[PDB]
């Protein structure tokens, strides 16, 4: 079992939880609970950069979200089949990560700044990100983003579709190919099990977890 | 000659400018001088997500800084031999990237925030990132970060080592291994010409260029 080091939150670890489940890979989680547990990881020398997420896979203590995601995607052929298909997967997913940063930020902002920032997410979703991904899908009518075969870009885009619906159900309403991508992926046996109740998938940020985060990562 | 679309600043284009010259590749730069030079790009449908950098390469109009670098690095075999070397290169370069964001964030701030934002970079440089990259060289004593060969990881770190030096010259002083990597990578024939005067290598952010920035985007 590769091992997942992080607090018990979506956070930066969540996109790795998604990818491994979609690859059929059982993993293990070791939840940081205090700044002390975290300090322990640093002092043991497990964290190259004194930060989490960290994943122990195949001999390595991997840090940096992208590095972990890259490795797992190549290991299970979810990173395309040539240098050109990587180009498209990387374009799409860096696009996906960008809308992600805004979404995480909002869940960590104060009540005061929350309206302005969601209005900015709503705006960029409908006008910038969703049309672009809808366009890709139409250009070829194929069931996946790249090479007509399951990749990470599909896993990551559908992860993001679930956050948008938590923020505003009608942002996907004029985008029918994303509507049906959302559907099909969700139904691939590995993503179905991951989506079902009691899986390792994490709920939205709420005040008590925000507290915990504040005190664990002493920021 | 693939074609770089960005303004006449470092920004997110610079790590791409550095990697290409280090690899030998001559490239074009078509500069964005105005809010409508960019508006144009969007309108022609050049920018997947309405943004730049964008690099016309091998038939693709590539956006996203990480997608562009990833491609260039693979094409020119600076991305490791196998999947496993890749993960070491990836962990490494993303670490360089986080202190990268700190240094760019500083350059776009007004002085009212700078003093402080610098104090943070210094603290993180000496106690976090520099020690991390020393420990990797010390452990293998080899001339490059990964696989006993030049990879993009050596390239990014040396670039970053160079901005640190503009900002506080003595941060690197207790790190004779990086101190040493800096010299070697810089005397590499390709990296030597890019470091020469007159190259496509970009000058530090200043007000003039900041005025342009606020104004184009
Ligand atoms: N480049 C990021 C950095 C990760 C990061 O900043 N991790 C946070 C938790 S969300 C952390 O460990 N904070 C503790 C610290 O920086 O000292 C990544 O994708 O892993
Ligand atoms: N994902 C980044 C995003 C690029 C980005 O935000 N670029 C700015 C210039 S530094 C831009 O084009 N801003 C216009 C906008 O987002 O509307 C990348 O690596 O390309």
From Swiss-Prot, chain B:
The residues that hold glutathione are 6, 42, 51-52, 64-65
One matching Pfam family, short form? GST_N
Q: Which GO terms describe its biological process?
A: epithelial cell differentiation; glutathione metabolic process; xenobiotic metabolic process
List residues of the GST C-terminal domain.
82-204
**Superkingdom per UniProt:** Eukaryota
Q: Spell out the Gene3D superfamilies in the cross-references.
A: 1.20.1050.10, Glutaredoxin
Its assembly, as annotated, is:
Homodimer or heterodimer of GSTA1 and GSTA2.
Provide the family line. Belongs to the GST superfamily. Alpha family.
Protein name, per record: Glutathione S-transferase A2
Q: Which organism is it from?
A: Homo sapiens
């Amino acid at each position: 079992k590769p091992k997942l080091h992080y607090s018990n939150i979506r956070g930066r670890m969540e996109s790795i939880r998604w990818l491994l489940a979609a690859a059929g890979v059982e993993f293990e989680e070791k939840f940081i609970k205090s700044a002390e547990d975290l300090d322990k990881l640093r002092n043991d020398g497990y964290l190259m950069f004194q930060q989490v997420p960290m994943v122990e896979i195949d001999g390595m203590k991997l840090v940096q979200t992208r590095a972990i995601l890259n490795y797992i995607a190549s290991k299970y052929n979810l990173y395309g089949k040539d240098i050109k298909e990587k180009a498209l997967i990387d374009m799409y997913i860096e696009g996906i990560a960008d809308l992600g940063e805004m979404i995480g930020d909002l869940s960590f902002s104060q009540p005061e700044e929350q309206d302005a920032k969601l209005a900015l997410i709503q705006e960029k979703t409908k006008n910038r990100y969703f049309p672009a991904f809808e366009k890709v899908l139409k250009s070829h009518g194929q069931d996946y983003l790249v090479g007509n075969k399951l990749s990470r870009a599909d896993i990551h885009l559908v992860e993001l579709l679930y956050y948008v619906e938590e923020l505003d159900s009608s942002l996907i309403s004029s985008f029918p190919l994303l509507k049906a991508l959302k559907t099909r992926i969700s139904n691939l046996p590995t993503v179905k099990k991951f989506l079902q109740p009691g899986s390792p998938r994490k709920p939205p940020m709420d005040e008590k977890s925000l507290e915990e985060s504040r005190k664990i990562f002493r920021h």
